mmCIF file of C-alpha atoms in Angstrom:
data_model
loop_
_atom_site.group_PDB
_atom_site.id
_atom_site.type_symbol
_atom_site.label_atom_id
_atom_site.label_comp_id
_atom_site.label_asym_id
_atom_site.label_seq_id
_atom_site.Cartn_x
_atom_site.Cartn_y
_atom_site.Cartn_z
ATOM 1 C CA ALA A 1 0.000 0.000 0.000
ATOM 2 C CA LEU A 2 1.262 3.460 -0.935
ATOM 3 C CA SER A 3 1.699 6.107 1.784
ATOM 4 C CA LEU A 4 0.174 8.733 -0.531
ATOM 5 C CA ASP A 5 -2.892 10.287 1.086
ATOM 6 C CA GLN A 6 -5.061 11.404 -1.809
ATOM 7 C CA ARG A 7 -6.921 14.099 0.177
ATOM 8 C CA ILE A 8 -3.604 15.814 1.052
ATOM 9 C CA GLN A 9 -2.253 15.199 -2.437
ATOM 10 C CA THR A 10 -5.254 16.977 -3.962
ATOM 11 C CA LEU A 11 -4.938 19.862 -1.464
ATOM 12 C CA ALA A 12 -1.212 20.164 -2.276
ATOM 13 C CA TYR A 13 -1.895 20.271 -6.018
ATOM 14 C CA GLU A 14 -4.698 22.821 -5.754
ATOM 15 C CA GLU A 15 -2.765 25.171 -3.463
ATOM 16 C CA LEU A 16 0.451 24.723 -5.452
ATOM 17 C CA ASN A 17 -1.128 25.563 -8.817
ATOM 18 C CA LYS A 18 -2.999 28.573 -7.331
ATOM 19 C CA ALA A 19 0.213 29.973 -5.871
ATOM 20 C CA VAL A 20 2.187 29.319 -9.062
ATOM 21 C CA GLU A 21 -0.550 31.171 -11.062
ATOM 22 C CA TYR A 22 -0.770 34.270 -8.875
ATOM 23 C CA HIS A 23 3.057 34.667 -8.797
ATOM 24 C CA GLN A 24 3.462 33.864 -12.493
ATOM 25 C CA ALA A 25 6.089 31.275 -11.782
ATOM 26 C CA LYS A 26 8.059 28.856 -13.901
ATOM 27 C CA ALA A 27 7.312 25.857 -11.669
ATOM 28 C CA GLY A 28 6.889 24.579 -8.154
ATOM 29 C CA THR A 29 6.870 21.657 -5.709
ATOM 30 C CA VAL A 30 5.261 20.559 -2.473
ATOM 31 C CA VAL A 31 6.288 17.691 -0.131
ATOM 32 C CA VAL A 32 4.144 16.625 2.798
ATOM 33 C CA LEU A 33 5.507 14.057 5.284
ATOM 34 C CA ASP A 34 4.249 12.349 8.360
ATOM 35 C CA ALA A 35 6.532 14.045 10.920
ATOM 36 C CA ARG A 36 6.834 10.941 13.120
ATOM 37 C CA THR A 37 7.127 8.103 10.575
ATOM 38 C CA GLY A 38 8.763 9.684 7.523
ATOM 39 C CA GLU A 39 5.861 8.538 5.283
ATOM 40 C CA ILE A 40 5.385 10.674 2.144
ATOM 41 C CA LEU A 41 1.763 11.845 2.320
ATOM 42 C CA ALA A 42 2.005 14.151 -0.695
ATOM 43 C CA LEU A 43 4.429 14.919 -3.463
ATOM 44 C CA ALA A 44 3.055 17.472 -5.961
ATOM 45 C CA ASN A 45 4.875 19.016 -8.936
ATOM 46 C CA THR A 46 3.819 21.349 -11.722
ATOM 47 C CA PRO A 47 4.048 19.703 -15.198
ATOM 48 C CA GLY A 48 7.436 18.286 -16.229
ATOM 49 C CA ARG A 49 9.829 16.135 -14.161
ATOM 50 C CA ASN A 50 9.547 15.174 -10.486
ATOM 51 C CA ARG A 51 11.447 18.268 -9.198
ATOM 52 C CA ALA A 52 10.939 17.343 -5.512
ATOM 53 C CA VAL A 53 13.343 14.524 -6.264
ATOM 54 C CA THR A 54 15.470 15.691 -9.238
ATOM 55 C CA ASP A 55 16.199 19.398 -8.716
ATOM 56 C CA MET A 56 18.950 20.297 -6.237
ATOM 57 C CA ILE A 57 18.478 23.673 -4.528
ATOM 58 C CA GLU A 58 20.435 25.740 -2.043
ATOM 59 C CA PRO A 59 18.438 25.551 1.177
ATOM 60 C CA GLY A 60 19.234 29.056 2.386
ATOM 61 C CA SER A 61 17.720 29.866 5.764
ATOM 62 C CA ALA A 62 16.079 26.435 5.985
ATOM 63 C CA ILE A 63 19.472 24.966 7.041
ATOM 64 C CA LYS A 64 19.864 27.400 9.954
ATOM 65 C CA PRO A 65 17.988 25.351 12.561
ATOM 66 C CA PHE A 66 20.389 22.471 12.124
ATOM 67 C CA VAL A 67 23.470 24.587 12.818
ATOM 68 C CA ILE A 68 21.844 26.042 15.923
ATOM 69 C CA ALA A 69 20.747 22.587 17.016
ATOM 70 C CA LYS A 70 24.289 21.192 16.564
ATOM 71 C CA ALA A 71 25.815 24.048 18.604
ATOM 72 C CA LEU A 72 23.342 23.446 21.467
ATOM 73 C CA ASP A 73 23.729 19.648 21.296
ATOM 74 C CA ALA A 74 27.543 19.940 21.491
ATOM 75 C CA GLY A 75 27.297 22.516 24.291
ATOM 76 C CA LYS A 76 29.180 25.158 22.282
ATOM 77 C CA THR A 77 26.404 27.571 23.134
ATOM 78 C CA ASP A 78 23.270 27.757 25.300
ATOM 79 C CA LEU A 79 20.014 29.749 25.653
ATOM 80 C CA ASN A 80 21.616 32.420 27.894
ATOM 81 C CA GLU A 81 24.479 33.412 25.611
ATOM 82 C CA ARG A 82 24.230 36.674 23.670
ATOM 83 C CA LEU A 83 26.360 36.915 20.573
ATOM 84 C CA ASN A 84 27.737 40.012 18.986
ATOM 85 C CA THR A 85 25.959 39.887 15.648
ATOM 86 C CA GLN A 86 27.435 42.962 13.966
ATOM 87 C CA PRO A 87 28.099 42.336 10.259
ATOM 88 C CA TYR A 88 31.670 41.300 9.504
ATOM 89 C CA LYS A 89 34.084 40.243 6.788
ATOM 90 C CA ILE A 90 36.451 37.343 6.365
ATOM 91 C CA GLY A 91 39.104 38.848 4.178
ATOM 92 C CA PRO A 92 37.270 40.564 1.346
ATOM 93 C CA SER A 93 33.975 38.620 1.747
ATOM 94 C CA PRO A 94 31.158 39.999 3.874
ATOM 95 C CA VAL A 95 28.645 38.286 6.156
ATOM 96 C CA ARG A 96 25.577 40.306 7.079
ATOM 97 C CA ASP A 97 21.944 40.038 8.131
ATOM 98 C CA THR A 98 18.953 41.932 6.703
ATOM 99 C CA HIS A 99 19.374 44.485 9.526
ATOM 100 C CA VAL A 100 22.188 45.362 11.899
ATOM 101 C CA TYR A 101 21.343 43.425 15.062
ATOM 102 C CA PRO A 102 24.137 44.421 17.450
ATOM 103 C CA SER A 103 23.567 41.439 19.707
ATOM 104 C CA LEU A 104 21.151 38.475 19.795
ATOM 105 C CA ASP A 105 20.641 35.401 21.934
ATOM 106 C CA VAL A 106 20.050 32.040 20.311
ATOM 107 C CA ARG A 107 16.301 32.610 20.226
ATOM 108 C CA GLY A 108 16.967 35.922 18.471
ATOM 109 C CA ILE A 109 19.270 34.257 15.920
ATOM 110 C CA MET A 110 16.479 31.836 14.954
ATOM 111 C CA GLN A 111 13.679 34.450 15.107
ATOM 112 C CA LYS A 112 15.502 37.043 12.984
ATOM 113 C CA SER A 113 17.137 34.340 10.897
ATOM 114 C CA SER A 114 20.608 35.874 11.456
ATOM 115 C CA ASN A 115 23.316 34.865 8.965
ATOM 116 C CA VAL A 116 25.880 36.438 11.289
ATOM 117 C CA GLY A 117 24.740 34.550 14.376
ATOM 118 C CA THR A 118 24.369 31.241 12.586
ATOM 119 C CA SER A 119 27.809 31.642 10.951
ATOM 120 C CA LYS A 120 29.533 32.336 14.287
ATOM 121 C CA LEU A 121 27.903 29.226 15.798
ATOM 122 C CA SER A 122 29.105 27.112 12.863
ATOM 123 C CA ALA A 123 32.592 28.618 13.307
ATOM 124 C CA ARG A 124 32.858 26.973 16.735
ATOM 125 C CA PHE A 125 33.243 23.678 14.821
ATOM 126 C CA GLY A 126 35.999 22.574 12.443
ATOM 127 C CA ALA A 127 35.358 22.294 8.739
ATOM 128 C CA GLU A 128 35.553 18.516 8.912
ATOM 129 C CA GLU A 129 32.969 18.348 11.728
ATOM 130 C CA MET A 130 30.513 20.492 9.790
ATOM 131 C CA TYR A 131 31.099 18.482 6.605
ATOM 132 C CA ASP A 132 30.351 15.197 8.407
ATOM 133 C CA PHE A 133 27.236 16.797 10.021
ATOM 134 C CA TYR A 134 25.889 17.884 6.605
ATOM 135 C CA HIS A 135 26.651 14.408 5.171
ATOM 136 C CA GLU A 136 24.865 12.812 8.150
ATOM 137 C CA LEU A 137 21.752 14.931 7.411
ATOM 138 C CA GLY A 138 21.756 13.177 4.010
ATOM 139 C CA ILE A 139 23.246 16.059 2.004
ATOM 140 C CA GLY A 140 25.127 14.587 -0.942
ATOM 141 C CA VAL A 141 23.581 11.159 -0.129
ATOM 142 C CA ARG A 142 21.065 10.170 -2.835
ATOM 143 C CA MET A 143 17.709 8.803 -1.715
ATOM 144 C CA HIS A 144 17.449 6.012 -4.335
ATOM 145 C CA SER A 145 13.732 6.875 -4.597
ATOM 146 C CA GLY A 146 13.698 5.051 -7.952
ATOM 147 C CA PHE A 147 13.038 8.072 -10.171
ATOM 148 C CA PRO A 148 15.070 8.945 -13.256
ATOM 149 C CA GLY A 149 17.452 11.897 -12.970
ATOM 150 C CA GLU A 150 17.562 11.798 -9.153
ATOM 151 C CA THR A 151 20.089 14.207 -7.548
ATOM 152 C CA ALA A 152 22.753 13.246 -4.978
ATOM 153 C CA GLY A 153 23.099 16.935 -4.072
ATOM 154 C CA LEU A 154 26.288 18.969 -3.683
ATOM 155 C CA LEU A 155 28.662 18.637 -0.711
ATOM 156 C CA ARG A 156 32.258 19.721 -1.483
ATOM 157 C CA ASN A 157 35.070 17.930 0.347
ATOM 158 C CA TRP A 158 35.947 19.808 3.580
ATOM 159 C CA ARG A 159 39.608 19.909 2.576
ATOM 160 C CA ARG A 160 38.669 22.316 -0.240
ATOM 161 C CA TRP A 161 36.577 24.790 1.848
ATOM 162 C CA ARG A 162 37.801 28.395 2.348
ATOM 163 C CA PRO A 163 36.843 29.828 5.794
ATOM 164 C CA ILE A 164 34.236 32.015 4.068
ATOM 165 C CA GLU A 165 32.675 28.812 2.536
ATOM 166 C CA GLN A 166 31.994 27.268 5.936
ATOM 167 C CA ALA A 167 30.175 30.426 6.972
ATOM 168 C CA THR A 168 28.160 30.608 3.772
ATOM 169 C CA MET A 169 27.139 26.902 4.038
ATOM 170 C CA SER A 170 25.861 27.587 7.607
ATOM 171 C CA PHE A 171 23.262 29.928 6.121
ATOM 172 C CA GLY A 172 22.478 27.592 3.185
ATOM 173 C CA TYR A 173 24.578 28.599 0.160
ATOM 174 C CA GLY A 174 27.246 26.445 -1.524
ATOM 175 C CA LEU A 175 25.645 23.099 -0.698
ATOM 176 C CA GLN A 176 22.608 21.668 -2.408
ATOM 177 C CA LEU A 177 19.875 19.063 -1.917
ATOM 178 C CA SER A 178 16.431 18.181 -3.321
ATOM 179 C CA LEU A 179 13.261 19.387 -1.618
ATOM 180 C CA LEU A 180 12.688 15.766 -0.611
ATOM 181 C CA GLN A 181 16.173 15.641 1.077
ATOM 182 C CA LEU A 182 15.401 18.885 2.905
ATOM 183 C CA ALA A 183 11.995 17.657 4.118
ATOM 184 C CA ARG A 184 13.780 14.477 5.234
ATOM 185 C CA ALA A 185 16.273 16.461 7.269
ATOM 186 C CA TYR A 186 13.438 18.131 9.181
ATOM 187 C CA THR A 187 12.447 14.738 10.616
ATOM 188 C CA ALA A 188 15.529 15.029 12.874
ATOM 189 C CA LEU A 189 13.830 18.049 14.450
ATOM 190 C CA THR A 190 10.268 16.663 14.509
ATOM 191 C CA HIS A 191 11.023 13.069 15.633
ATOM 192 C CA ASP A 192 12.917 14.201 18.779
ATOM 193 C CA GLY A 193 16.443 14.130 17.322
ATOM 194 C CA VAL A 194 15.998 11.027 15.142
ATOM 195 C CA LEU A 195 16.449 11.301 11.381
ATOM 196 C CA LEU A 196 14.051 8.978 9.487
ATOM 197 C CA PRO A 197 14.726 7.387 6.104
ATOM 198 C CA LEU A 198 11.389 8.347 4.429
ATOM 199 C CA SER A 199 9.123 5.902 2.623
ATOM 200 C CA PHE A 200 6.648 5.751 -0.257
ATOM 201 C CA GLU A 201 4.995 2.781 1.529
ATOM 202 C CA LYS A 202 2.710 2.681 4.567
ATOM 203 C CA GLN A 203 4.516 1.919 7.825
ATOM 204 C CA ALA A 204 2.554 0.338 10.678
ATOM 205 C CA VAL A 205 5.298 1.496 13.077
ATOM 206 C CA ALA A 206 7.960 4.224 12.714
ATOM 207 C CA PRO A 207 11.115 2.830 11.138
ATOM 208 C CA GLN A 208 14.455 2.746 12.865
ATOM 209 C CA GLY A 209 16.173 6.023 12.077
ATOM 210 C CA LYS A 210 19.396 7.361 13.484
ATOM 211 C CA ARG A 211 20.082 9.852 16.203
ATOM 212 C CA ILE A 212 21.477 13.229 15.182
ATOM 213 C CA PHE A 213 20.449 15.349 18.200
ATOM 214 C CA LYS A 214 19.575 14.735 21.822
ATOM 215 C CA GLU A 215 15.814 14.673 22.363
ATOM 216 C CA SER A 216 16.137 17.664 24.706
ATOM 217 C CA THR A 217 17.972 19.592 21.985
ATOM 218 C CA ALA A 218 15.312 18.852 19.368
ATOM 219 C CA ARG A 219 12.481 19.816 21.725
ATOM 220 C CA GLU A 220 14.220 23.100 22.545
ATOM 221 C CA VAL A 221 14.837 23.937 18.894
ATOM 222 C CA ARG A 222 11.193 23.298 17.939
ATOM 223 C CA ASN A 223 10.226 25.846 20.620
ATOM 224 C CA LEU A 224 12.724 28.362 19.205
ATOM 225 C CA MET A 225 11.325 27.829 15.685
ATOM 226 C CA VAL A 226 7.833 28.935 16.800
ATOM 227 C CA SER A 227 9.299 32.454 17.225
ATOM 228 C CA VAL A 228 9.727 32.429 13.433
ATOM 229 C CA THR A 229 5.985 32.382 12.789
ATOM 230 C CA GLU A 230 4.955 34.748 15.635
ATOM 231 C CA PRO A 231 5.155 38.567 15.347
ATOM 232 C CA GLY A 232 8.838 39.613 15.226
ATOM 233 C CA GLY A 233 9.847 36.539 13.202
ATOM 234 C CA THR A 234 10.595 36.375 9.502
ATOM 235 C CA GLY A 235 7.925 33.671 8.825
ATOM 236 C CA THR A 236 4.625 35.149 10.013
ATOM 237 C CA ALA A 237 3.208 34.387 6.555
ATOM 238 C CA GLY A 238 3.075 30.678 7.504
ATOM 239 C CA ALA A 239 1.191 31.183 10.787
ATOM 240 C CA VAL A 240 -1.738 28.687 11.042
ATOM 241 C CA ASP A 241 -4.845 29.546 13.069
ATOM 242 C CA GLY A 242 -5.187 27.274 16.089
ATOM 243 C CA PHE A 243 -1.610 25.950 16.105
ATOM 244 C CA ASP A 244 1.975 26.752 17.010
ATOM 245 C CA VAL A 245 4.065 26.410 13.828
ATOM 246 C CA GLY A 246 7.850 26.017 13.726
ATOM 247 C CA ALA A 247 9.123 27.039 10.305
ATOM 248 C CA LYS A 248 11.808 28.621 8.125
ATOM 249 C CA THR A 249 11.558 30.630 4.987
ATOM 250 C CA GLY A 250 14.193 31.239 2.365
ATOM 251 C CA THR A 251 15.011 32.860 -0.937
ATOM 252 C CA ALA A 252 17.832 31.700 -3.205
ATOM 253 C CA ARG A 253 19.249 33.341 -6.338
ATOM 254 C CA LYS A 254 20.014 31.299 -9.482
ATOM 255 C CA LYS A 255 15.523 35.010 -10.777
ATOM 256 C CA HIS A 256 14.892 33.494 -7.327
ATOM 257 C CA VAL A 257 13.655 30.219 -5.698
ATOM 258 C CA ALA A 258 11.211 30.902 -2.851
ATOM 259 C CA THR A 259 10.941 28.253 -0.116
ATOM 260 C CA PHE A 260 8.875 27.765 3.048
ATOM 261 C CA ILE A 261 9.217 24.696 5.259
ATOM 262 C CA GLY A 262 7.720 23.911 8.642
ATOM 263 C CA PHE A 263 5.904 21.592 10.987
ATOM 264 C CA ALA A 264 2.983 21.573 13.415
ATOM 265 C CA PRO A 265 1.831 21.096 16.068
ATOM 266 C CA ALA A 266 5.266 22.462 16.984
ATOM 267 C CA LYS A 267 5.487 20.797 20.408
ATOM 268 C CA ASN A 268 4.170 17.431 19.199
ATOM 269 C CA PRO A 269 4.552 17.518 15.410
ATOM 270 C CA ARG A 270 2.440 15.481 13.017
ATOM 271 C CA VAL A 271 3.105 17.025 9.615
ATOM 272 C CA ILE A 272 5.998 18.537 7.713
ATOM 273 C CA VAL A 273 5.111 20.721 4.771
ATOM 274 C CA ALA A 274 7.757 21.992 2.336
ATOM 275 C CA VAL A 275 6.982 24.293 -0.589
ATOM 276 C CA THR A 276 9.297 25.623 -3.281
ATOM 277 C CA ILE A 277 8.202 28.166 -5.966
ATOM 278 C CA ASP A 278 10.636 28.450 -8.868
ATOM 279 C CA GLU A 279 11.138 31.955 -10.393
ATOM 280 C CA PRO A 280 8.129 33.973 -9.296
ATOM 281 C CA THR A 281 7.706 36.999 -11.639
ATOM 282 C CA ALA A 282 4.724 38.672 -9.882
ATOM 283 C CA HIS A 283 3.433 39.869 -6.491
ATOM 284 C CA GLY A 284 6.783 39.360 -4.705
ATOM 285 C CA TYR A 285 9.709 36.975 -4.718
ATOM 286 C CA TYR A 286 10.634 36.265 -1.049
ATOM 287 C CA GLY A 287 9.960 32.847 0.502
ATOM 288 C CA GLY A 288 7.611 34.382 3.085
ATOM 289 C CA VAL A 289 5.313 36.166 0.584
ATOM 290 C CA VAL A 290 5.459 33.588 -2.231
ATOM 291 C CA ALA A 291 5.614 30.212 -0.422
ATOM 292 C CA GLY A 292 4.160 31.144 2.970
ATOM 293 C CA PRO A 293 0.494 31.281 1.837
ATOM 294 C CA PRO A 294 0.435 27.880 0.083
ATOM 295 C CA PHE A 295 2.313 26.434 3.068
ATOM 296 C CA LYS A 296 -0.236 28.015 5.423
ATOM 297 C CA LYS A 297 -3.251 26.534 3.582
ATOM 298 C CA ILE A 298 -1.637 23.139 2.955
ATOM 299 C CA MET A 299 -0.560 22.808 6.599
ATOM 300 C CA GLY A 300 -3.917 24.053 7.971
ATOM 301 C CA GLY A 301 -5.804 21.739 5.620
ATOM 302 C CA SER A 302 -3.576 18.719 6.333
ATOM 303 C CA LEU A 303 -4.058 19.093 10.071
ATOM 304 C CA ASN A 304 -7.822 19.231 9.545
ATOM 305 C CA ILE A 305 -7.831 16.238 7.053
ATOM 306 C CA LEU A 306 -5.785 14.226 9.584
ATOM 307 C CA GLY A 307 -8.074 15.285 12.455
ATOM 308 C CA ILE A 308 -5.399 16.995 14.535
ATOM 309 C CA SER A 309 -7.004 19.240 17.146
ATOM 310 C CA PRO A 310 -6.057 22.947 17.537
ATOM 311 C CA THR A 311 -3.792 23.666 20.562
ATOM 312 C CA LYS A 312 -5.030 27.263 21.037
ATOM 313 C CA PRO A 313 -8.337 29.089 20.375
ATOM 314 C CA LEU A 314 -9.206 30.170 16.817
ATOM 315 C CA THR A 315 -9.013 33.941 16.193
#
């Protein structure tokens, strides 16, 4: 039996095509996963190849929670520390946020999606350590989903990284993975530190995954990610009525790729929804404005289809 849930699949398709239309986009993709089993509930693409599987993207801000999580798990930072987050340069190359945040704690780094903060946390680890961590998340490790033209992704050997490259990978540029590989990686956050393999078949019990983070680390990071979708966070466009939503939004240059990925209920997650809109030419181009609304309706609808009850009153 296939894990595909046709009610979610149809919702994904309808909300995908609507969003692609309004933004006058080249193409798009949606992945919906069971957050506790890794089952693929929906996989929707606009006409052409299976892009969810075949097209490698730079994850941008969507990688940031993993770097934060690794720094907390290793004890290289904590929730009290405040980092100087002034923009900086490494040699001629700059690292900067969207605003000058002079200092931020770890919650602030997630909430404001700080390149500077995330890059300084990554810099507490050696290149080799970060390379192995990215490889362990599945980056550069092909899924063998059984589709033609599947991507392995891009993960350059750590021996060839310049110190600027480590920093830029920590905020999601210079490594690449499919949307399906990215949605997979989020299972390490949702399933209490345990990365799941993903499946196109129904699973009567969660498969054996592998531990990436301590359960306490994963729980703490999910709580931090809710700040992203509440006022003051960069991802308010993916807020869902009735629920706490942990999410990230991102925009990559190639013309842009707009991405929004998240999970809910944040404390006890049941669904991961990932949306990518390729080359929006109308009504905005940022991940929040372009991919946030389809994410918001697909997540809200999935929760309802699956009968998950709201955790807070409906405004």
